[PDB]
């Protein structure tokens, strides 16, 4: 095989498993498992406690010399076990249980495949700058193309599509072994990117207005995920609708929902214009308007022909958030950093965003969906315009520590 498309089709692999389920594992647990919000938001808590170790446990690797293509082998295999349980748990406590394994096994992932890459690429004589971006792709690539073909097939509903990504999950495997071999001794003199986070790189809480900062972009961040966890439950629930039952925004959600992974990745590509045109605050402000707007265009959205374009608007503006968010509060917080603790400050602002945020935001959200659901209806609009409600007081947070001298 040509190494370039054997680390396509594993980029590719790697995220289409994990995008079989992730979207619509609520609406399963919700509509097929008769969950509540609560435990649906808890379920999707663990991927934060997952997330918050990888640092430790890609460390690990590193330091006891671990072979990132052999843990990778590993990792994917307790990721295929996991979720063929997943599609066999019916409590939730234990879905919990499955998810938080696979979660542990599956987030130390997000590392593994780069360092694989690199290494496998420099071996051939190949151009790293240049060649990660046509790999990196693939995966976004094929992440859409599982929402997709789960959401055509009728896999919505099932469990399915847990049994699709621990296929996936065993084909990456055994796909896996055909990866050049690569002595982990070749892969040293390098100081990892795990060793920029560590019990030293909370030093960075030292100074009050930092340590206030990441607080507020660890609460803002709370709500990064929400809608990948819970915007297919909303859609779903214009089934009691007989107007809407019929419509392929209520039946399709996953790829009515697709719009906003897509925008998160074309939006990319007008960061630079924005960061350079208006500077880091304006940026962080476009940002929270977009997750305001986001929320509130769910509250106001129907399968209706104004609604649907409603919907549709939020689900383009989703990506203006996500990535903006990222890159103004990545940039920001190394704006403030002393050169040195600059990497590192990067690194711990997008740990405490995405990773505690999904933590606090899972189990909180949860809450929210729980609260307005009786009778087993939940009241979309109230929830959507709580979400919104608190993105417009984090601009206010947001803008109170801006103006602060």
Not at 226 to 234: A, C, D, L, P, V
Not at 318 to 329: M, V
Request: charged fraction near 10%; include cysteine; aromatic fraction near 16%.
């Amino acid at each position: 095989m040509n190494l370039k498309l054997q680390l396509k089709i594993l980029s590719f692999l790697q995220f289409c498993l994990w995008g079989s389920w992730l979207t619509t594992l609520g609406s399963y647990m919700f509509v097929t498992l008769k969950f509540d919000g609560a435990s649906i938001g808890a379920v999707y808590s663990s991927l934060g406690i997952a997330a918050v170790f990888m640092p430790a446990l890609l460390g690990i690797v590193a330091d006891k010399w671990l072979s990132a293509k052999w843990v990778y082998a590993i990792c994917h295999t307790i990721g295929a076990i996991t979720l063929f349980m997943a599609a066999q748990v019916t409590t939730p406590e234990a879905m919990f249980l499955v998810i938080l394994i696979n979660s542990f096994a599956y987030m130390p992932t997000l590392g593994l495949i780069n360092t694989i890459s690199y290494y496998r690429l420099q071996n051939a004589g190949m151009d790293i700058v240049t060649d990660f971006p046509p790999i990196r792709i693939w995966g976004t690539i094929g992440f859409i193309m599982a929402m997709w073909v789960v959401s055509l097939s009728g896999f919505e509903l099932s469990h399915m599509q847990l049994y699709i990504g621990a296929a996936l999950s065993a084909i990456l495997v055994l796909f896996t072994l055909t990866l050049p071999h690569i002595p982990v001794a070749k892969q040293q003199a390098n100081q990892s990117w795990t060793t920029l986070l560590g019990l030293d790189a909370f030093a960075l809480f030292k100074n009050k207005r930092m340590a206030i900062f990441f607080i507020f972009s660890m609460l803002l961040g709370a709500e990064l995920q929400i809608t990948n966890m819970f915007g297919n439950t909303f859609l779903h629930s214009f089934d009691k609708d007989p107007m809407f039952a019929s419509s392929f925004i209520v039946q399709h959600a996953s790829i009515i929902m697709s719009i906003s992974q897509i925008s998160e990745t074309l939006f990319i590509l007008t960061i630079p214009f924005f960061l350079s045109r208006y500077g880091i605050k304006n940026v962080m402000m476009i940002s929270i308007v977009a997750w305001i707007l986001r929320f509130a265009l769910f509250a106001y959205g129907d399968p209706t022909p104004f609604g649907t374009v409603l919907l549709v608007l939020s689900m383009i503006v989703y990506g203006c958030a996500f990535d903006f968010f990222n890159i103004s509060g990545s940039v920001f917080v190394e704006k403030e950093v002393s050169p040195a603790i600059r990497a590192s400050a990067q690194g711990m602002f997008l740990m405490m965003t995405n990773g505690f945020g999904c933590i606090l935001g899972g189990i909180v959200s949860g809450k929210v969906v729980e609260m307005y659901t009786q009778n087993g209806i939940t009241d979309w609009q109230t929830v959507w315009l709580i979400f919104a409600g608190y993105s417009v007081v984090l601009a206010f947070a947001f803008m109170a520590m801006f103006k602060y001298k």
